[PDB]
C-alpha cells in the first residue's frame, strides 16, 4: 500500500484492575470528506484478546479476514489450546515487518488488548514493525492529545478500577472531539474481562460551548 | 586513511595508520588496517571497512582449499586474480575497495593492487588512501631498490608521519610489517605523538 | 459521472448519467454505465473505463460459473465479495468505483459500496462518481426511511438531475433500473 | 527381493546397504588408535608395480591442520567425501573464527552419506576413520555407508578387519602412551598382511595436541621398523 | 508375492505389505520405555554396544526445552525426522513467541510420513519415535509408527522383545500417577530389565534416562548421573 | 511516499573489565517529538556470559535479536556446546553483511567474558565490520561519552598519573556519572538506567533512575 | 488378476481392481454409523480399545472440518487424517473467496473430485478411507453425505460404515426419523452400536457421539455424555 484511500483515526486503550478497555470512533474519512460515517473499527478476537486499528481501512478488512481464519483453525483441533494475547502480538509484528521488507507495506497502526491468566495485556503495533507494551496507548493525534492525560493519572495512581478507567476514556474521547479535524461524535467502547469480550454501542459525547459567547 | 607498500631487494614493506572516522567524528584510533590473510599473504584496508574485511576473509577461505587440494601454496598473481573476479560481479552496486596484495612467491616478491572498479595491476610502489598523495612525495624522494633493511624501516615510518600531519583523516598509531621469503613478520607499532618528539629533535 | 443506488422494501433502484468524457471532450454522448451480471444483480461503474469493463467481465465469468455448480441463484453479497478480491489485490493498478446492488431471495434488496481503495460496506443508499460531491448534502436531508418504489424512482431522478445540471463531467440522459423479485424494469428518462 | 534401495525385506532390512558394507571388505586394512597423548594411525599400501608411483596412492589425507583421515573401499566414492569434509571445516571457520570439532565434522559428512535415495543414486562404497585433537582432547571416530556414526577407541577396518580387531582388543588399555601404541600397531599389521613388512608397504600418521603440524612420518618410519 | 514390491500396489486382501514390513524394522532396534506421572514424564532407553571398546550408540536426544524424543529403527530416518522436528519448534518460537503444543507437533509428523507411504519413489520411514512433552495441559507420552498412526498413551514400550515390558506396565499403571520423581524413574527401569536376557544386568554404561518436568527442562543423563538412579534396586527374581 | 526507516534513539555503553564486563543502557523509547514508553531496556542476555545491546531503528532490533537466539540453538544441537563470546561476534558480522544492499539500521555492542575469564567488548557498524576494544559507547549520545572515558579509563592527555586497572566498584560510579551528564544535554536519554554486570558467577542487573523530562 | 497392478489399467471385462481392493480394506474397520433427524445430524462410532494403554479419547475418528461440518471416518486412520486436512483447507478458501460458510452439497463435490484423482494415475494409489459428512443450517436444514474410495458421493438419511454395514442399516430403517428430535436420536444411536458385537470376538470398546443441529445453534461438537450418561444407561437395557 502506497496511498491510503479511506482512513480512520486515533484509538485509545488503557489497562485497569482485571481487564483492558479500548475505544475508537466510527468514521471512514476519505481525505477531508467524512464519507463512511457508520463503520466498526474494533474486532472481537476469540474470548480474551481484542483488536482495534487505525490507518487504512481496506487493509484492516484484510487482517480481519486472516486473523478470523487462524482462530477458527485452532478451535477445530479441540486440544484445549488457544492463542494468548501476547501470541497475537507476536504474530502480527512479524506480519508487518515482513511486509515492509518487500516495500509494499500495510498502512495501519494497531492496538491489541487482552486479558488472560489474571493478567492484562496492552500492545502496540506500528506500520514499520515497531512494537512495545505499555499501561496506556494512543494512536494518531491521540498520542499528542490524549496521551498526556493518560500518563498523569497513572503516575499519580498506578492502578485503576473499572469505573475509573471507563470514565477516564470518555474524558479523553471528548477532548479529541474538540481539536481533531477527523473526529466524529459517535464512538464505541470495547472491554475485556475474565467474563469475556464486550462491545458497547454507538455512544456519544457531551460538549461545552460557553466560550463562544465570549469575544 | 593512509597505506603504502613497496618492494625492494629484501622483500616487501607494508605500513598503515590506525584512524577510522565517521563524517567529522573519530570512531576509533586502534583500527588494524592491515589484514593478515595467511602466514604468507597480507592485505590492506583502504576504502570501506566491512567491504575490505569481508572479501579478503572470503579470499582466505578460498586459498586454504587450494592448498589442501593441490598440496602447494597459491601464487600471489593467482590470489590477486581471484579477488578481482569476485568484486567485478558487483560492479556498479556500490562497493568501496582499494586494497593491495603482498606476499613472497616462487617468482620472488609480489605486489598487486586491486580496486573495486577492477584495476588489477602490479608494480613496485603503491600508496592508497585519503592521505595517499602526501605519501607519494616523501617516499619516492627516498626510495631505492638497494635500500638496507633498517633504512627501509625508517623510510616507511617517516612517510606515514608526513601523511598524518597534513591530512585530517589519518592518525593514531603507525603499524609496520615486513614480508620475508619464509613469511611475514611484524616489525613495530609506534604512536605519532612519540614520533613527533623523535623527528622534531 | 454520477451513480446512484437506493434500496427499498421490495428491492433496489439504480441510476446513472452517461457523458463518457476524455479531458474536456465528450467521447460518448450516451453510455450504459450500469451493467448486468446475473438476472437479479447489477453494478454501476465509475473511474477508468477500460479498467471497470475488464473487471466486470471477469466477475460475470466467475459468478456465472459459480451458480451453475450450486444450481442456486447467487447471493448479492457473493457478487460484492468478488469485486473486493480483484480490487484489493490489483490496487495501485486500477481506478474502480463499483457499486453493487440487486435483489436476493434470501435477503431481499441490498446495496454494497466498493470504492477505489478496495473496502466493502453495506449501506441503505450509496452514491459515487466525480459529481457525487455536489448532491451529497441534498441526499441525506431528503432521504427518509420506509419509502415505496415510486418514491425512490422520484428520489433518484431529482438527485441525479442536480449533479447533471452542475458537474461538467456529468449530464446527458438518465438511465434507471428497478430490481425486485418480479423482474427488471429499465427505463431512459429526461427531466 | 532387493535389487533397489526403495524396497524392504519381510524381516527387516537392506539387502542394499548390506551389500555396500561388503564392498568395504575388499579394501586395504587400516588401524587407528586413540590415546591420551594423541591419535596415531596406520595403513597398508598394497603397491602393484614398481613403475607405479607410490605417493599417488593416498590412504591418509589431511582434512584440516588438526584432523587426519583414513579410508578403505572404493576410491571413486572416497574422493567426493574428502572434498566436502575440507569445505565444511572451512565454512565453519569462515563464520565462527574457530576450528570445527572432530565429532561435528563427521555429522556434516554423514549428512550426505545418507542422501542416496532421499532426494525429493546408490549408497557410497567407503568406510572412514577420523582422528583429531579438539578441545576435548584427542578423538577417534568411525562411519559407514549407512551413515551410522560412532566413536571408537581403537578401530581397524578394510580387509583383515575381524582378524585385527580380535588381536587388537588383547593389547589395548587406557593408560597407553603414543610411542607405545605406534609399535603396538604395526605388530598387528605384519601379522595380517602377506608381504615382509618394510618401509614401502605401510605409512603412518600421528596427531598430537602441541604438534598440530606433521600428521605423517617421513623415513623416520625406517627407524621404527628396526625397533620391532 | 507378486503384490509384494511397491507401496502403491494394494493386495487382493487389502493389506499393503510394504507398510507391514516397516513395522518389522522397528523390532530390530533395542527396547525403550516411556511413562508419566501427573507432573513428570520420563522416558528411559537401552543402549547397545557395537564392539567391546567402541562407545555405545545413543538413543535419547534433545529437541527443545520441553520436548525430547527416543528412537528405534533406522538411524537414517532418525536424524532425518529430527531435523524436521527441530525446525518446526523454533518456528513457533520465532513467529508466535511461544513453545509448541506437543499434540499438534505430532500431527505434523503424521502429515510428513503420510506422503512417502502413498506416492511411488520413496520408502516409508522405518522409525519408532517416543515423545515426551509439556504443553499447557501437562505431560504427554506419544508414540508413532511407520504407518503414521500416532497414539496418545500413558505408558508404552517398543523395540526388540518389548512385550515383557508392556506386561509389567499394565499391572503397575495405576501406581504411576501418584509417585514422585524418584521412584517413577525406577518404576520405569524395572520394566527394561525384563527386556533383557536373565544373565546380564542393567549397568551404568548401557542405559540413558531423560526427564522433562513441570518446572524442569528436558535433561539427558548418561553414565555418571545414572548412579543416583541405579541405587535402591533389588536383584532379579531368579 | 513510504520510507522504510525511522530513528528511535537510545544509548549503549560497554566496558571490558579485567574479569568482568558492564553493559548499560537507558529505557526510553522515543520517536520524533514523542515518548512511546519509559520502560524499554536495550540489554539482552544471550548466554550466561554474553550480553548484547541494540540501538537505532527499533523494528530491526526486535528482528535481529530473534535471529540470533534461533542460531544459538542451531549451534548447540549441532555442536553440543554453547557459543563463545568471540564466536558470536564472528557470526553476527556475516548476518549483518548478508543484507548489504538493504541494511539493518542497528548499532551493536557485544560485551561478555572470553574463554579465559576476562572482559571482551566488540563494537559494530550497520554493515558488519567489527573489532575488539576495551570500551565503546554507541547510540545517540555516543559523542558525549567517548571523550570522558578516554580521560578516566584510557588515561589519555594526563601527565604523571599511574595506571591502576579499573576495579569493579570504581567502574560502577563511572557508569552512573556519565549518564547523568548525558541526560542533561541529550533529549533522547532518560527515565531509567538498566545496568548488567557479567562476572564468573552469573549476570547481575541493577536499575538507577534518571530525570523524567 | 495379472491386470490389477496399476490403477491406470482396465480389466478384460472393464473394471479396475485396485479400486476394488481398496474398498474392502475399509470393510475390516470398526463400525461407524450416521443418522439425521428433522433438525440435525447425529454421528456415532464404535471404537475399540487397543490394549489398555489407550488414554481415553486418543486417536478419535470424529473429526471437525469447519464451524458446522465434521467427519465420521472409518478405514486407515492415518490416511483419513491427511484427507481431513484437505477438507479443512478447502473450506478456508471458500471463506476467503466468497465470504460465507461452505454449503455441504458443494463441499462434498470438492472432496470427491480430489479422491477421484488418486484413482487414475499409476504413481499413486487410491485412498483406503470412507467417511460421513454432516451439517446443519437454517436456510438448508440438515444434510448427510457419504464418500466411497472410488469417489461416488450422494446423500442418505442413515448410513453405516464398517464390518456391519448391512447388519446396522437393517435396523436403522425401522425408525421414524422424519419426525424425531435429535435429542431422542442420541439414545437411539446408542442401542444400534450396542446391538452389534459388544465383546464377542473383541474385548472392549468405547462409544463416541458427535452432534450437530438446531440445538447446538449450528455448532458441531461432541455430546455431553459425561453429562447424564444416558447412552449406556439405555443401550444396556436391551440385554433381555
From Swiss-Prot, chain B:
The active site is at 1 (nucleophile). Changing residue 49 to V: Displays high resistance to the bortezomib, a proteasome inhibitor of the chymotrypsin-like activity. The keyword Hydrolase applies. Its main location: cytoplasm. Induction: Down-regulated by IFNG/IFN-gamma (at protein level). Induced in breast cancer tissue. Up-regulated by sulforaphane in breast cancer cells. GO terms for molecular function: endopeptidase activity; peptidase activity; threonine-type endopeptidase activity. It is an enzyme of class 3 (hydrolase). It catalyses: Cleavage of peptide bonds with very broad specificity. It is found in: Cytoplasm; Nucleus. Component of the 20S core proteasome complex involved in the proteolytic degradation of most intracellular proteins. This complex plays numerous essential roles within the cell by associating with different regulatory particles. Associated with two 19S regulatory particles, forms the 26S proteasome and thus participates in the ATP-dependent degradation of ubiquitinated proteins. Belongs to the peptidase T1B family. This is Proteasome subunit beta type-5. The gene is PSMB5. The chain holds residues 60 to 260 of 263 of the full protein.
From Swiss-Prot, chain C:
The active site is at residue 1. Induction: Down-regulated by IFNG/IFN-gamma (at protein level). Up-regulated in anaplastic thyroid cancer cell lines. Keywords: Acetylation, Cytoplasm, Host-virus interaction, Hydrolase, Nucleus, Phosphoprotein, Protease, Proteasome, Threonine protease, Zymogen. It is an enzyme of class 3 (hydrolase). Belongs to the peptidase T1B family. The lineage of its organism: Eukaryota, Metazoa, Chordata, Craniata, Vertebrata. It comes from Homo sapiens (Human). The chain holds residues 35 to 225 of 239 of the full protein. One of its GO terms (biological process) is proteasome-mediated ubiquitin-dependent protein catabolic process. The gene is PSMB6. One of its GO terms (cellular component) is cytoplasm. Its main location: cytoplasm. This is Proteasome subunit beta type-6. Signal peptide: none annotated. The modification Phosphothreonine is found at residue 35. The keyword Calcium does not apply. Component of the 20S core proteasome complex involved in the proteolytic degradation of most intracellular proteins. This complex plays numerous essential roles within the cell by associating with different regulatory particles. Associated with two 19S regulatory particles, forms the 26S proteasome and thus participates in the ATP-dependent degradation of ubiquitinated proteins. GO terms for molecular function: cadherin binding; endopeptidase activity; threonine-type endopeptidase activity. It catalyses: Cleavage of peptide bonds with very broad specificity. It is found in: Cytoplasm; Nucleus. Disulfide bonds: none annotated. Its EC number is 3.4.25.1.
Swiss-Prot record, chain E:
Glycans are attached at residue 107. GO terms for cellular component: centrosome; cytoplasm; cytosol; extracellular exosome; nucleoplasm; nucleus; proteasome complex; proteasome core complex. The 26S proteasome consists of a 20S proteasome core and two 19S regulatory subunits. The 20S proteasome core is a barrel-shaped complex made of 28 subunits that are arranged in four stacked rings. The two outer rings are each formed by seven alpha subunits, and the two inner rings are formed by seven beta subunits. The proteolytic activity is exerted by three beta-subunits PSMB5, PSMB6 and PSMB7. Interacts with NOTCH3. Interacts with ZFAND1. This is Proteasome subunit alpha type-1. It is found in: Cytoplasm; Nucleus. Belongs to the peptidase T1A family. PANTHER family: PROTEASOME SUBUNIT ALPHA/BETA. GO terms for biological process: immune system process; negative regulation of inflammatory response to antigenic stimulus; proteasome-mediated ubiquitin-dependent protein catabolic process. Component of the 20S core proteasome complex involved in the proteolytic degradation of most intracellular proteins. This complex plays numerous essential roles within the cell by associating with different regulatory particles. Associated with two 19S regulatory particles, forms the 26S proteasome and thus participates in the ATP-dependent degradation of ubiquitinated proteins. Pfam families: Proteasome, Proteasome_A_N. The keyword Acetylation applies.
From Swiss-Prot, chain F:
GO terms for cellular component: cytoplasm; cytosol; extracellular exosome; extracellular region; ficolin-1-rich granule lumen; nucleoplasm; nucleus; proteasome complex. Gene3D superfamilies: Glutamine Phosphoribosylpyrophosphate, subunit 1, domain 1. Its main location: cytoplasm. The keyword Acetylation applies. The modification Phosphoserine is found at residues 34, 40, 134. The modification Phosphotyrosine is found at residue 122. Changing residue 75 to H: In NEDMHAL; uncertain significance; results in impaired proteasome assembly. The modification N6-acetyllysine is found at residue 176. The keyword Cytoplasm applies. Transmembrane segments: none annotated. InterPro entries: Ntn_hydrolases_N, Proteasome_bsu_CS, Proteasome_sua/b, Proteasome_suB-type. GO terms for biological process: proteasome-mediated ubiquitin-dependent protein catabolic process; proteolysis involved in protein catabolic process. It comes from the Eukaryota. Glycans are attached at residues 30, 181. Belongs to the peptidase T1B family. Non-catalytic component of the 20S core proteasome complex involved in the proteolytic degradation of most intracellular proteins. This complex plays numerous essential roles within the cell by associating with different regulatory particles. Associated with two 19S regulatory particles, forms the 26S proteasome and thus participates in the ATP-dependent degradation of ubiquitinated proteins. PANTHER family: METALLOPROTEASE TLDD, PROTEASOME SUBUNIT BETA TYPE-1. This is Proteasome subunit beta type-1. The lineage of its organism: Eukaryota, Metazoa, Chordata, Craniata, Vertebrata.
Amino acid at each position: 500500500t502506497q496511498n491510503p484511500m479511506v482512513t480512520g483515526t486515533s484509538v485509545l486503550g488503557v489497562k485497569f484492575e482485571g481487564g483492558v478497555v479500548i475505544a475508537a470512533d466510527m468514521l471512514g474519512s476519505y481525505g477531508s470528506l467524512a464519507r463512511f460515517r457508520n463503520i466498526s473499527r474494533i474486532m472481537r478476537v476469540n474470548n480474551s484478546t481484542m483488536l482495534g486499528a487505525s490507518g487504512d481501512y481496506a487493509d484492516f478488512q484484510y487482517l480481519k479476514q486472516v486473523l478470523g481464519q487462524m482462530v477458527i483453525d485452532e478451535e477445530l483441533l479441540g486440544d484445549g489450546h488457544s492463542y494468548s494475547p501476547r501470541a497475537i502480538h507476536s504474530w502480527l509484528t512479524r506480519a508487518m515487518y515482513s511486509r515492509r521488507s518487500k516495500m509494499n507495506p500495510l498502512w495501519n497502526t494497531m492496538v491489541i488488548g487482552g486479558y488472560a491468566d489474571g493478567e492484562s495485556f496492552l500492545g502496540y503495533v506500528d506500520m514499520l514493525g515497531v512494537a512495545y507494551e505499555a499501561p496506556s496507548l494512543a494512536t494518531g493525534y491521540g498520542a499528542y492529545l490524549a496521551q498526556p492525560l493518560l500518563r498523569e493519572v497513572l503516575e499519580k495512581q498506578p492502578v485503576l478500577s473499572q469505573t475509573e478507567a471507563r470514565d477516564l476514556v470518555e474524558r479523553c474521547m471528548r477532548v479529541l472531539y474538540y481539536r481533531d479535524a477527523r473526529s466524529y461524535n459517535r464512538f464505541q467502547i470495547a472491554t475485556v474481562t475474565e467474563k469475556g469480550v464486550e462491545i458497547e454501542g454507538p455512544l456519544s459525547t457531551e460538549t461545552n460551548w460557553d466560550i463562544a459567547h465570549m469575544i | 586513511t593512509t597505506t603504502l607498500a613497496f618492494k625492494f631487494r629484501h622483500g616487501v614493506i607494508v605500513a598503515a595508520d590506525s584512524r577510522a572516522t565517521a563524517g567529522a567524528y573519530i570512531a576509533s584510533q586502534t583500527v588494524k588496517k592491515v589484514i593478515e590473510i595467511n602466514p604468507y599473504l597480507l592485505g590492506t584496508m583502504a576504502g570501506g571497512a566491512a567491504d575490505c574485511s569481508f572479501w579478503e576473509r572470503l579470499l582466505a577461505r578460498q586459498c586454504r582449499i587450494y592448498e589442501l587440494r593441490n598440496k602447494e601454496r597459491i601464487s600471489v598473481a593467482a590470489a590477486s586474480k581471484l579477488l578481482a573476479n569476485m568484486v567485478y560481479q558487483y560492479k556498479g552496486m556500490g562497493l568501496s575497495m582499494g586494497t593491495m596484495i603482498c606476499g613472497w612467491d616462487k617468482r620472488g616478491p609480489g605486489l598487486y593492487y586491486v580496486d573495486s572498479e577492477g584495476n588489477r595491476i602490479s608494480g613496485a610502489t603503491f600508496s592508497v588512501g585519503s592521505g595517499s598523495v602526501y605519501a607519494y612525495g616523501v617516499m619516492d624522494r627516498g626510495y631505492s631498490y638497494d635500500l638496507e633493511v633498517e633504512q627501509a624501516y625508517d623510510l616507511a615510518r617517516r612517510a606515514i608521519y608526513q601523511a598524518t600531519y597534513r591530512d585530517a583523516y589519518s592518525g593514531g598509531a603507525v603499524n609496520l610489517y615486513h614480508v620475508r621469503e619464509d613469511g611475514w613478520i611484524r616489525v613495530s607499532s609506534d604512536n605519532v605523538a612519540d614520533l613527533h618528539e623523535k623527528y622534531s629533535g | 459521472t454520477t451513480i446512484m443506488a437506493v434500496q427499498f422494501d421490495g428491492g433496489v433502484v439504480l441510476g446513472a448519467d452517461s457523458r463518457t468524457t476524455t479531458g474536456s471532450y465528450i467521447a460518448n454522448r450516451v453510455t450504459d454505465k450500469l451493467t448486468p451480471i446475473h438476472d437479479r444483480i447489477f453494478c454501476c461503474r465509475s473511474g477508468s473505463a477500460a479498467d471497470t469493463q475488464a473487471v466486470a467481465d471477469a466477475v460475470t465469468y466467475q459468478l456465472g460459473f459459480h451458480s451453475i455448480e450450486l444450481n442456486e441463484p447467487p447471493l448479492v453479497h457473493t457478487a460484492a465479495s468478488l469485486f473486493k478480491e480483484m480490487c484489493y489485490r490489483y490496487r495501485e493498478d486500477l481506478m474502480a468505483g463499483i457499486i453493487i446492488a440487486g435483489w436476493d431471495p434470501q435477503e431481499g434488496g441490498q446495496v454494497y459500496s466498493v470504492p477505489m481503495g478496495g473496502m466493502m460496506v453495506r449501506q441503505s443508499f450509496a452514491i459515487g462518481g466525480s459529481g457525487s460531491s455536489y448532491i451529497y448534502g441534498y441526499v441525506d436531508a431528503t432521504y427518509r426511511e420506509g419509502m415505496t418504489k415510486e418514491e425512490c424512482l422520484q428520489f433518484t431522478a431529482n438527485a441525479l438531475a442536480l449533479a447533471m445540471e452542475r458537474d461538467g463531467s456529468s449530464g446527458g440522459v438518465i438511465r434507471l433500473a428497478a430490481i425486485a423479485e418480479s423482474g427488471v424494469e429499465r427505463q431512459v428518462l429526461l427531466g | 527381493y532387493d535389487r533397489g534401495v526403495n524396497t524392504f525385506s519381510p524381516e527387516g532390512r537392506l539387502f542394499q546397504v548390506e551389500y555396500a558394507i561388503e564392498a568395504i571388505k575388499l579394501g586395504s586394512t587400516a588401524i587407528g588408535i586413540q590415546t591420551s597423548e594423541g591419535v596415531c594411525l596406520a595403513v597398508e599400501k598394497r603397491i602393484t608395480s614398481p613403475l607405479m608411483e607410490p605417493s599417488s596412492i593416498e590412504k591418509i589425507v589431511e582434512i584440516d591442520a588438526h584432523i587426519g583421515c583414513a579410508m578403505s573401499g572404493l576410491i571413486a566414492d572416497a574422493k567426493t567425501l574428502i572434498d566436502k569434509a575440507r569445505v565444511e571445516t572451512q565454512n565453519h571457520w569462515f563464520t565462527y573464527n574457530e576450528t570445527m570439532t572432530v565429532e561435528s565434522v563427521t555429522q556434516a559428512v554423514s549428512n550426505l552419506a545418507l542422501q542416496f535415495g532421499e532426494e525429493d543414486s546408490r549408497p557410497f562404497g567407503v568406510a572412514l576413520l577420523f582422528g583429531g585433537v579438539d578441545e576435548k582432547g584427542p578423538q577417534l571416530f568411525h562411519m559407514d555407508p549407512s551413515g551410522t556414526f560412532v566413536q571408537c577407541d581403537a578401530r581397524a577396518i578394510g580387509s583383515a578387519s575381524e582378524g585385527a580387531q580380535s588381536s587388537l582388543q588383547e593389547v589395548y588399555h587406557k593408560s597407553m602412551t603414543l610411542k607405545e601404541a605406534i609399535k603396538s600397531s604395526l605388530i598387528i599389521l605384519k601379522q595380517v598382511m602377506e608381504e615382509k613388512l618394510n618401509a614401502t608397504n605401510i605409512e603412518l600418521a600421528t596427531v598430537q595436541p602441541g604438534q598440530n603440524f606433521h600428521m605423517f612420518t617421513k623415513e623416520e618410519l625406517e627407524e621404527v621398523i628396526k625397533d620391532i | 508375492n507378486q503384490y509384494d514390491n511397491d507401496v502403491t500396489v494394494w493386495s487382493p486382501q487389502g493389506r499393503i505389505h510394504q507398510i507391514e514390513y516397516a513395522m518389522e524394522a522397528v523390532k530390530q532396534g533395542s527396547a525403550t520405555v516411556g511413562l508419566k506421572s501427573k507432573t513428570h514424564a520420563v522416558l528411559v532407553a537401552l543402549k547397545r554396544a557395537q564392539s567391546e571398546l567402541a562407545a555405545h550408540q545413543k538413543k535419547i536426544l534433545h529437541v527443545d526445552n520441553h520436548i525430547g524424543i527416543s528412537i528405534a529403527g533406522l538411524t537414517a530416518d532418525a536424524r532425518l525426522l529430527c531435523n524436521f522436528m527441530r525446525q518446526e519448534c523454533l518456528d513457533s518460537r520465532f513467529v508466535f513467541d511461544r513453545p509448541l503444543p506437543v499434540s499438534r507437533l505430532v500431527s505434523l509428523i503424521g502429515s510428513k510420513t503420510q506422503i512417502p507411504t502413498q506416492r511411488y519413489g520413496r520408502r516409508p520411514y522405518g522409525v519408532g519415535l517416543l515423545i515426551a512433552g509439556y504443553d499447557d495441559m501437562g505431560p504427554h507420552i506419544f508414540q508413532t509408527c511407520p504407518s503414521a498412526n500416532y497414539f496418545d498413551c500413558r505408558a508404552m514400550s517398543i523395540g526388540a522383545r518389548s512385550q515383557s515390558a508392556r506386561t509389567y506396565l499394565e499391572r503397575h499403571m495405576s501406581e504411576f500417577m501418584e509417585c514422585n520423581l524418584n521412584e517413577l524413574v525406577k518404576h520405569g527401569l524395572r520394566a527394561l530389565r525384563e527386556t533383557l536376557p536373565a544373565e546380564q544386568d542393567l549397568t551404568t554404561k548401557n542405559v540413558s534416562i531423560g526427564i522433562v518436568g513441570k518446572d524442569l527442562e528436558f535433561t539427558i543423563y548418561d553414565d555418571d548421573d545414572v548412579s543416583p538412579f541405579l541405587e535402591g534396586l533389588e536383584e532379579r527374581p531368579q | 511516499r513510504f520510507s522504510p526507516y525511522v530513528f528511535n534513539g537510545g544509548t549503549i555503553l560497554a566496558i571490558a573489565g579485567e574479569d568482568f564486563a558492564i553493559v548499560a543502557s537507558d529505557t526510553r523509547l522515543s520517536e520524533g517529538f514523542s515518548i512511546h514508553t519509559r520502560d524499554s531496556p536495550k540489554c539482552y542476555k544471550l548466554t550466561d556470559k554474553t550480553v548484547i545491546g541494540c540501538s537505532g531503528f527499533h523494528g530491526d532490533c526486535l528482528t535481529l535479536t530473534k535471529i540470533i537466539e534461533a542460531r544459538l540453538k542451531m549451534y548447540k544441537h549441532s555442536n553440543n556446546k554453547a557459543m563463545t563470546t568471540g564466536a558470536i561476534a564472528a557470526m553476527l558480522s556475516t548476518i549483518l553483511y548478508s543484507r548489504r544492499f538493504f541494511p539493518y539500521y542497528v548499532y551493536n555492542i557485544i560485551g561478555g567474558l572470553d574463554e579465559e575469564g576476562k572482559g571482551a567488548v566488540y563494537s559494530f557498524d550497520p554493515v558488519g565490520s567489527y573489532q575488539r576494544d576495551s570500551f565503546k559507547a554507541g547510540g545517540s549520545a555516543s559523542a558525549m561519552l567517548q571523550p570522558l572515558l578516554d580521560n578516566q579509563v584510557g588515561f589519555k592527555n594526563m601527565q604523571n598519573v599511574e595506571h591502576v586497572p579499573l576495579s569493579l566498584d570504581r567502574a560502577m560510579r563511572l557508569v552512573k556519572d556519565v549518564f547523568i551528564s548525558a541526560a542533561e544535554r541529550d533529549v533522547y536519554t532518560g527515565d531509567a538506567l538498566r545496568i548488567c554486570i557479567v562476572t564468573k558467577e552469573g549476570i547481575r542487573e541493577e536499575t538507577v533512575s534518571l530525570r523524567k523530562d | 488378476t495379472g491386470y490389477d497392478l496399476s490403477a491406470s489399467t482396465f480389466s478384460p471385462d472393464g473394471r479396475v481392481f485396485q479400486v476394488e481392493y481398496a474398498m474392502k480394506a475399509v470393510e475390516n474397520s470398526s463400525t461407524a454409523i450416521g443418522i439425521r433427524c428433522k433438525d440435525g445430524v447425529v454421528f456415532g462410532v464404535e471404537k475399540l480399545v487397543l490394549s489398555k494403554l489407550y488414554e481415553e479419547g486418543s486417536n478419535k475418528r470424529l473429526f471437525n472440518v469447519d464451524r458446522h461440518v465434521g467427519m465420521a471416518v472409518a478405514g486407515l486412520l492415518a490416511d483419513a487424517r491427511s484427507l481431513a486436512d484437505i477438507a479443512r483447507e478447502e473450506a478456508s478458501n471458500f471463506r476467503s473467496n466468497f465470504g460465507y460458510n461452505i454449503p455441504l452439497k458443494h463441499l462434498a463435490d470438492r472432496v470427491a473430485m480430489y479422491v477421484h484423482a488418486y484413482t487414475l494415475y499409476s504413481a499413486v494409489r487410491p485412498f483406503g478411507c470412507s467417511f460421513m459428512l454432516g451439517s446443519y443450517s437454517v436456510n438448508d436444514g440438515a444434510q448427510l453425505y457419504m464418500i466411497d474410495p472410488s469417489g461416488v458421493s450422494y446423500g442418505y438419511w442413515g448410513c453405516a460404515i464398517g464390518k456391519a454395514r448391512q447388519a446396522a442399516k437393517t435396523e436403522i430403517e425401522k425408525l421414524q426419523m422424519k419426525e424425531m428430535t435429535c435429542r431422542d436420536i442420541v439414545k437411539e444411536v446408542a442401542k444400534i452400536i450396542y446391538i452389534v458385537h459388544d465383546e464377542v470376538k473383541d474385548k472392549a470398546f468405547e462409544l463416541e457421539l458427535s452432534w450437530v443441529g438446531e440445538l447446538t445453534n449450528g455448532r458441531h461438537e461432541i455430546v455431553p455424555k459425561d453429562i447424564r450418561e444416558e447412552a449406556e444407561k439405555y443401550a444396556k437395557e436391551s440385554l433381555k
